Design a protein around this ligand. Sequence first.
Ligand code: NI
Ligand SMILES: [Zn+2]
Lengths: 347, 4
Amino acid sequence: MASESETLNPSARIMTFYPTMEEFRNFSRYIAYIESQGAHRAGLAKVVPPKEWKPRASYDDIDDLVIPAPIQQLVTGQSGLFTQYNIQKKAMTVREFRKIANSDKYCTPRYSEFEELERKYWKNLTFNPPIYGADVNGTLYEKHVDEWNIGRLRTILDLVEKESGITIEGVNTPYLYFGMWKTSFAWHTEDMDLYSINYLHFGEPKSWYSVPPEHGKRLERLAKGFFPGSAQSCEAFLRHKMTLISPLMLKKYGIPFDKVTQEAGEFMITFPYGYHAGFNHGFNCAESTNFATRRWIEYGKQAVLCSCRKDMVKISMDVFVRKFQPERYKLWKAGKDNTVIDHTLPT
Amino acid sequence: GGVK
Ligand code: NI
Ligand SMILES: [Zn+2]
């Protein structure tokens, strides 16, 4: 009855992969592999790299590195629905950040198991606004690291800079994130509904929520219903990355979602149109960027973009359609391309 | 273009 791809990961659950060193070396081959297993159906996958693999010898020299725009996260709301406001604070070093993160005021509360920590997160997220060293331009990777180097993954997203010279910070260049307890990332898909890779360099875990691409529209419909003012002002208000929605709120409205906790030394991959949100457990450092595969192309063509801010990420799809969909270029350009996306299909 |  059902198709081959529809049969793989039928519950759209977050999958975890443990590649051997051999399997790990070819990044784009490995992405294609995990999609052949239906990982993309979750919106989010975990990749644990081989034990004898490291992106950096040590993180002992990084104390003096600067965070030029740390933000204080003022969260407003109740009953599982919140809006996060970012207050930009003055530049600080990693050392100045770590001292504050581990200080009694801002540190992780004691707890037995994740569910307790998670309950404390949703209970206290509007109190004691934390500071996130978010969106810091840079890599922690060593120059010679050729495997899964966030600074040079060599996917087809490279065609953007290749074609145009255009660098989009955090999208085709890496970002670093210095977290503390209760720092959050709001519900969003990537810019242009791209993939992302996130590597947690060191520190306390980062917890993630995901909604399957298959159910993305369901999440948006809920969001639009809960924030009708924001939906009137913007065609894609979730891209403001201000909207927090607890897992209990999602259960209540029957939106499928899954959860994963990422540890130090683990990769998270998000897939096109996979909505994700989450929080940090304590002091930590993550590195991320966006990337693409041929399967992204149609998502990029159909991505609904923020209509109310001028600085938003906007990639010309022209070069991708021209190069990888030549049959459809003339049709697409005349606005007559009616391709429906199958979220289960790989490649 | 833009910024993330
Ligand atoms: Ni993301
Ligand atoms: Zn907008």
